[PDB]
Design a protein around this ligand. Structure first.
Ligand SMILES: NC(=O)c1ccc[n+]([C@@H]2O[C@H](COP(=O)([O-])OP(=O)(O)OC[C@H]3O[C@@H](n4cnc5c(N)ncnc54)[C@H](O)[C@@H]3O)[C@@H](O)[C@H]2O)c1
Ligand SMILES: NC(=O)c1ccc[n+]([C@@H]2O[C@H](COP(=O)([O-])OP(=O)(O)OC[C@H]3O[C@@H](n4cnc5c(N)ncnc54)[C@H](O)[C@@H]3O)[C@@H](O)[C@H]2O)c1
Ligand SMILES: NC(=O)c1ccc[n+]([C@@H]2O[C@H](COP(=O)([O-])OP(=O)(O)OC[C@H]3O[C@@H](n4cnc5c(N)ncnc54)[C@H](O)[C@@H]3O)[C@@H](O)[C@H]2O)c1
Ligand SMILES: NC(=O)c1ccc[n+]([C@@H]2O[C@H](COP(=O)([O-])OP(=O)(O)OC[C@H]3O[C@@H](n4cnc5c(N)ncnc54)[C@H](O)[C@@H]3O)[C@@H](O)[C@H]2O)c1
Lengths: 332, 332, 332, 332
């Protein structure tokens, strides 16, 4: 399937890289009004976090050429003005972060796009996490949401734990790496004052709806999960900490065994499993949505456990966006 | 009371600074075989985390002179060889971290010390947290432990919450700043391989006995609390995240009100309270054991809440060591 | 003298704090259209880098009250619309960074301001560094520039070295801490692509005109100095490295002696001197423009030396802005 | 040639990885008394800086098996006790850092090693930098030194600049990433007190003999070069800043052209060249000894220029150790 990408930030560029790295979808158009073609070459080629791009990238005839494939470049501030149809983009990755509603994402449909995939949590678009509820998608849904990186980490582990033991209630804290929304030094932020404080200097607490959003993709867990986030001075990798009351008794070894069986089975490539003394850098550029950390977690008793899951919030989420597009194209 | 300090690391130096800043105890002797007198002057004077020492510090006649008070300096590897009695040190702050047992800490008693206060968790010495169980101390206990920084953060909040609502069970994660035991780059560590990975680069998971140690100082909570730690790339401030099942129903406002009343009452100066958009740097050089973060925490229902508490793991713990010594001297 | 402050960023807030800390000038008005009064209270009160503000700050009757002194707050995007005269602000600290020309800074003069002090390098406003050329100011200059933090570091040391030995030619590199213009992660920047790369992750090279701007305030050094900058992952403190060919022979001890004599004399409080094993955190919240690091620097021969000078690029520059205003008020 | 490796730290492990990545030499024995076989598996497999090891690594029958090649493991504190000859190690990479003299490195010769390559600067062993003076090696030198990472960065650029223009005198500052010798928090260091201060918190000044060591490998530059270092809070990549007086006039374009021609010619793979807006992360895992940064550097006039060169102080130096061993084996 041919894919257009709206926005060339972390999510847009890394979705493009995942498309080229795996070859699963073909990027044909990119829209970003604030990044010119040559600046796009520079930003795609050099990445502080994930290294230099393997393969080639250059500007030719007003087009971005990645691995010999010319990509049409648009500079539009309004999505409706983008000529997705002329470039042949059937799907569009809405990755700017400011068009995360059905009506705002349908502006891409006006521009010739057949379907729109929002790479952020959406207030009203149907939300899918690969390996959790993606089979609930059907070819009548024009606009979908891939949820968040944190949601794509929590939802598979929560699905496994609820399926085998039953989550009566769970509380989540994610220790999250620095993102583009933060400030290098103490500065103004609209209403989230803590996010305005210097990111390298601080442990910063944040509200996140990812744990509650797990209730959308796992309806039986609706209202049983919520949590918060502490932003910390790390570039890329984040970790999920889920503390939950289990309906059925579960020794920690039983949870480990069930999660390992899930990681080796239907959730392979989505839910990871490890028993090594892993740290955050060990999952940089990892493509899993969630890697269960067996040794990091701890249990108080048979019904109250604390579960740890790592996730590259950049690479894994982009690969999941690509996989969602592949599944939607398969269901055409 | 006159105090000797064994070890001149973070804990020893900051305990000395707290002694001089508040004037509550008199430091008269310091033992450290790896730090000479002039190096001691340098390390006490300049602090990356807490700034330069207000007041004066210089070497005179083989003695460390802080604010005009001469301090005898010993360079001994074996605590029994230290002449605490000749210097007049009635109390000794065992802050090296490698003499955290009753028999090892009694070597200071051999050297003329009347009492020994271990500034680390102890396997067998009686353990006290200020504001939680310190009134259980009596003048017949020669060797005591001040627990850990994390324990001194968790125990007061846990005491308040258990007293008013009852903690059926709680799980703790502390997001902890970098400490001296970590490595700048990936390097060898004896058995804790994760602690060997570069501290600035990683979110690092760690086992900690602080939550279980809260059961020592609050016996009714024994076996009902445990947890883990994630070390992160920050210099000083750490935060406690307590997720607990409450015996009695508690709206989040009720918990806030109870904790604020405790912070304004018997636990004043020990348990802090704030409703501001605080980040970690806002508690650097703070002397509280635990400052409740009202806005950071979240509740799922009336019986399952996630509570957030900040703590300067260096300054607060040192001030608590000083306060424990003051209380013990009062109970002489 | 009564001072208005345009912009409430790092420079504006720290200039306000320096005004209140030293009591040398009276802040009466602050203009910032993007930061409301209560957000101004928060941002002034809590500082990640310099700690919490000693003293009180709260909102009263639409005014910012710092240490009991009410400050009028304006929310204007155009400087000409600001009613500086009604608030009584004789001087204005133009600290936004986007009004650094005579014509743009005169909009404040339209609003009732008697004089305007630009806290950034200016293309055409007369430029002054305290202790270097500030006596060249006269009461006929309505609009002046305080140069940059880097210029205020280099110019006093360069003045001393040129006066005593003669700088045939010098090249400067400043290792500079992270500032507000950088990005937490790799992101778009207009034309300076390197400044768009993640600040915590990288050593980042940058062009700076500070060394050439030293030629403005020391005319004999015009065209003899230039340099560059490497931005690094540190919050506050920066260091200047000056490599220069000396007209007259100078042993390193002679340079040390001359610089120490200057630091103890006419440049006291402006040019610092130390022979201690200082690191960057040892100058956090330091108010000097430049502290000579005797041990850090090295000489190749009697005519080719590398000189090292530390500077808190936030605190020192703000205190120099305050001192420039005090001198201008004295020359009224 | 078959290679033994003494020490399994950053240098030893990365030299092993470079040996396996390029296949140029065969690692057959590793000695490290502080790292057991399974800990060696862990430390080799997971790298925070350079990512996970591509290929396989596991413990089999008391041996480290990297890519199916069994490596004999020794746990000896004294080099003379190591049985290099039994394992068949013809060359030994002395990478511990504490056997950097001819007599100390000859203990490996006692253990059956034919030749010893010290991966640190040596006081008396002959010193070689690839592309600078390595052709001065001959098969009669049993013990050699590969100099330092900084020396391997400076020497090729200095060689090119001196050959084409002539370096009358140069001063060097390297902005260097954090290394294993530093401390996470303020702590004791033997005599280098600044290196004891927290590495993540500070810009730290350091003495380095690399610029003077360039005079060893380029005799015509002896006594004409020296410099210093500022350690900064970055994990891996370092940059060299060379400020030099040129004997012959050189426009900056001429220097750029000469350096680019050298990078494309005899120094290919050793001296890099780029004109992109590179930052430090753009050279992580780069194998060049020195990549000239054309845009970063600046000139004051035709005889006084400041030249910038990046270098991965870990990967590049290890690859140069491998290349030196390959050249020595070719000259057998
Ligand atoms: N990086 C993560 O960890 C992560 C993971 C999952 C989801 N997300 C979410 O995805 C969204 C994208 O964030 P990012 O991580 O890509 O960072 P980012 O801020 O680098 O990307 C934003 C890019 O969008 C472009 N843009 C802005 N307005 C536009 C417009 N009107 N039309 C077109 N292009 C426009 C800008 O050029 C900018 O480069 C955010 O909302 C983030 O919350 C982030
Ligand atoms: N910094 C914190 O956050 C914190 C808080 C509470 C408790 N603690 C615990 O307290 C202990 C002290 O740690 P720190 O934080 O002071 O760091 P640190 O490692 O700087 O202090 C150790 C100091 O002890 C000295 N020393 C070593 N062996 C000695 C001996 N045999 N006799 C005398 N002196 C000796 C060394 O010179 C070193 O400077 C650790 O076990 C730490 O776990 C740390
Ligand atoms: N921090 C340093 O190291 C330092 C030192 C000396 C000089 N400077 C220079 O001073 C300038 C100020 O930078 P800062 O360091 O204060 O950081 P900063 O970016 O925090 O400050 C900018 C503030 O100005 C306000 N502002 C923006 N547009 C405005 C407008 N049109 N009218 C009024 N207010 C407006 C914003 O609210 C923002 O908070 C920059 O150009 C910087 O280069 C910085
Ligand atoms: N990493 C760099 O940037 C770099 C580059 C070039 C040269 N160097 C130099 O190379 C030397 C090695 O440093 P590293 O960077 O490998 O870091 P490192 O400190 O991780 O390596 C040291 C290793 O040597 C082992 N070791 C210690 N004593 C030993 C002994 N007696 N016998 C055998 N093995 C022993 C220890 O297990 C440790 O893991 C240092 O002197 C460093 O200055 C470093």
């Amino acid at each position: 399937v041919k894919v257009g990408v709206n926005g060339f930030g972390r999510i847009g560029r890394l979705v493009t890289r995942a498309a080229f790295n795996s070859g699963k979808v073909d990027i044909v158009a990119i829209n970003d009004p604030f990044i010119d073609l040559h600046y796009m070459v520079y930003m795609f080629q050099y990445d502080s976090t994930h290294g230099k791009f393997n393969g080639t990238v250059k500007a030719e005839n007003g087009k971005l050429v990645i691995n010999g494939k010319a990509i049409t470049i648009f500079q539009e501030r309004d999505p409706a003005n983008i000529k997705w149809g002329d470039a042949g983009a059937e799907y569009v990755v809405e990755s700017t972060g400011v068009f995360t509603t059905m009506e705002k994402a349908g502006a891409h449909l006006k521009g010739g796009a057949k379907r729109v995939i929002i790479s952020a949590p959406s207030a009203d678009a149907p939300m899918f996490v690969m390996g959790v509820n993606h089979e609930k998608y059907n070819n009548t849904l024009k606009i979908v949401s891939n949820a968040s990186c944190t949601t794509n980490c929590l939802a598979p582990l929560a699905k496994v734990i609820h399926d085998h033991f039953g989550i009566v209630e769970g509380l989540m804290t994610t220790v999250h790496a620095i993102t583009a929304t933060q400030k290098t030094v103490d500065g103004p932020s609209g209403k989230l004052w803590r996010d305005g404080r210097g990111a390298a200097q601080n442990i910063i607490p944040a509200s996140t709806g990812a744990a509650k959003a797990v209730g959308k993709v796992i309806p039986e867990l609706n209202g049983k999960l919520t949590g918060m986030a502490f932003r910390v001075p790390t570039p890329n990798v984040s970790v999920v900490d889920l503390t939950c009351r289990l309906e059925k008794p579960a020794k920690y070894d039983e949870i480990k065994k069930v999660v390992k069986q899930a990681s080796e089975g239907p959730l392979k490539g989505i839910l990871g499993y490890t028993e090594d003394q892993v740290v955050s850098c060990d999952f940089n550029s990892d493509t899993h949505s969630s890697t269960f950390d067996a040794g990091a977690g701890i249990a108080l008793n048979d019904h109250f456990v604390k579960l740890i899951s790592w996730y590259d919030n950049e690479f894994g989420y982009s690969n999941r966006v690509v996989d969602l597009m592949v599944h939607m194209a398969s269901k055409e």
